[PDB]
Design a protein around this nucleic acid. Structure first.
Ligand SMILES: [Ca+2]
Lengths: 100, 80, 99, 105, 99, 80
DNA sequence: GCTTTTTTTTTTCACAATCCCGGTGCCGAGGCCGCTCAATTGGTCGTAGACAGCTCTAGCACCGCTTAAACGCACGTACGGAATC
């Protein structure tokens, strides 16, 4: 083998895979398709975060809470997508708090 | 009946004048009302969201300004 | 000797007049009630700063005027002088407002 | 020790997301509930694209998702098409769509 | 007799073919030379990642394909089937790309 | 050299076909080269700007992805 | 009424192109591995925002008057769209 480790490069791909095997267990994903799924996750991270950042800033608050994320989500996603995304985020917070 | 009809044919004619239009089909006046309602729908939805997020029952000018910026239609002169 | 202007002549006077002015061209009250009417569909018992409804109007009027300019070109492009619903529809299609 | 992901019943990395928020200049401070909420939203959206992108593959008689499959899935859904209206999916191509007036009689 | 398709029939075939496919339709090298040529105006002796040129191409063709959709709608709107420079120009004027 | 001619007629016709175009004026091809060039100049100028700010002598795909995002023309799949 | 003439309409009939199939063979999806680095756990301090309790702003209800704008309608010109070339 050869010396010097290539420098770390973060991605979401192991989590895209994991979600992929829930939804379509007998289905894989190409190299460039994963590059797209990455570019997607990063896009929506940025959009949501930015809007929450602004919401917090408008109402004179230092802290982004799950509340901000929800409001941003309601502003950014279309109708049905927002509902489900609001449900799942709520579920996730509810579940996380009670498992402390 | 509908407040949408309160946006009258003569007001519509004035708007299209300012936009340099000389001659106007009869059908436009409804068509315009459609567009305008969808415009307000979209802008007001996001403004009220900012209001509901601020825990207020009163929509400020700033609420609209942030809503209009999000919709790509930045607005000057109202506390920007 | 009853005087008559030809079709288009007063329209042309109106254009010239309205382009020169800056005053809002929708009656303010019917507008305010329309804003209040639509606002109900998201939240009931909502109050509006007067400046908020004025922003909304200033906004609504600029966008529509602008859309008329784009619509007008679509009509002219099809060798017409009369704007029609399909002109508005092409315009908003190209602007990326509708699919 | 078990991850914040497992507490929240998620696949997406709640810990990573929380750090990205702290390190991305969005606010001075970050609530504990935020990264949980966000991670979940990104996972949902991801799941919704992968469900639809899988279907386009299966319908192409293919096992692995490709860029086309994503594109088809996205543009054929009114909501996703809106969400990603100003986004270009490389090696996606376009939906087959010939205007009716151009067709023979 | 030697067989011949009527004007319009292969044009439609070509559409169906290219809309089905996802491959880039500009020849990669002439494009790359063009990218290097334009890039000189801003800074000389510039290198390019290969992926940067592919990114630039993916983006150019998606822009232009898209622009041709809007253009084709503008020609149709004037009851034409043939795209012309004025169609592209109007499309771009509406998009806001050009004054 | 003089590479814009390398965007050939047939390659322009191919793009137009993917864009659903059936019939194409003779004047379209030079007109399209103009647009394509204008498009590239703008995207590349910002890319190069990013490259220069990073003190590099080699344009990255990120430089181009970041430039494209700046033109409201987001691109997925090149590290975006 | 019916024969003749004529375009439609409609069917045969070649031929190009695009679609499926299996067969082949190659290369990156996929998963395993071992290490590293960032996440977690479990400490402490500090304050940011939730909360109550108050002020008093400006947002709403309502009335009565004065026009000015909105509304119909009678009338005809100039546009749109159809057709032919
Ligand atoms: Ca305080």
């Amino acid at each position: 083998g050869k010396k010097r480790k290539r420098s770390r490069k973060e991605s979401y791909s192991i989590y895209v895979y994991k979600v992929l095997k829930q939804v379509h267990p007998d289905t894989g994903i190409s190299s460039k398709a994963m590059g797209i799924m990455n570019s997607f996750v990063n896009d929506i991270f940025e959009r949501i975060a930015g809007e929450a950042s602004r919401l917090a800033h408008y109402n004179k608050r230092s802290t982004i809470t799950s509340r901000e994320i929800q409001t941003a989500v309601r502003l950014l996603l279309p109708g049905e997508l927002a509902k489900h995304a609001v449900s799942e985020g709520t579920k996730a917070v509810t579940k996380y708090t009670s498992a402390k | 009946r509908d407040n949408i009809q309160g946006i009258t044919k003569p007001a519509i004619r004035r708007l299209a004048r300012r936009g340099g239009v000389k001659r106007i089909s009869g059908l436009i006046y409804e068509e315009t009302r459609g567009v305008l309602k969808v415009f307000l729908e979209n802008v007001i939805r996001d403004a009220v969201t900012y209001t509901e997020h601020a825990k207020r029952k009163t929509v400020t000018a700033m609420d609209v300004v942030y809503a209009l910026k999000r919709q790509g239609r930045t607005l000057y002169g109202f506390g920007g | 000797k009853p005087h008559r202007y030809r079709p288009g002549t007063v329209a042309l006077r109106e254009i010239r007049r309205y382009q020169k002015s800056t005053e809002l061209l929708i009656r303010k009250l019917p507008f305010q009630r329309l804003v209040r009417e639509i606002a109900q569909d998201f939240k009931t018992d909502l109050r509006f700063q007067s400046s908020a409804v004025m922003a909304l109007q200033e906004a609504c009027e600029a966008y529509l005027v602008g859309l008329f300019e784009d619509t007008n070109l679509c009509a002219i492009h099809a060798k017409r002088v009369t704007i029609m619903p399909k002109d508005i529809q092409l315009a908003r299609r190209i602007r990326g407002e509708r699919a | 020790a078990k991850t914040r992901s497992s507490r929240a019943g998620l696949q997406f990395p709640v810990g990573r997301v929380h750090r990205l928020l702290r390190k991305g200049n969005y606010s001075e401070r970050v609530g504990a509930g935020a990264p949980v909420y966000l991670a979940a939203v990104l996972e949902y959206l991801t799941a919704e694209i992968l469900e639809l992108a899988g279907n386009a593959a299966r319908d192409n008689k293919k096992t692995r998702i490709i860029p086309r499959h994503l594109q088809l899935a996205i543009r054929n859904d009114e909501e996703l098409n809106k969400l990603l209206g100003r986004v270009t999916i490389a090696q996606g191509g376009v939906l087959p769509n010939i205007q009716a007036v151009l067709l023979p009689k």
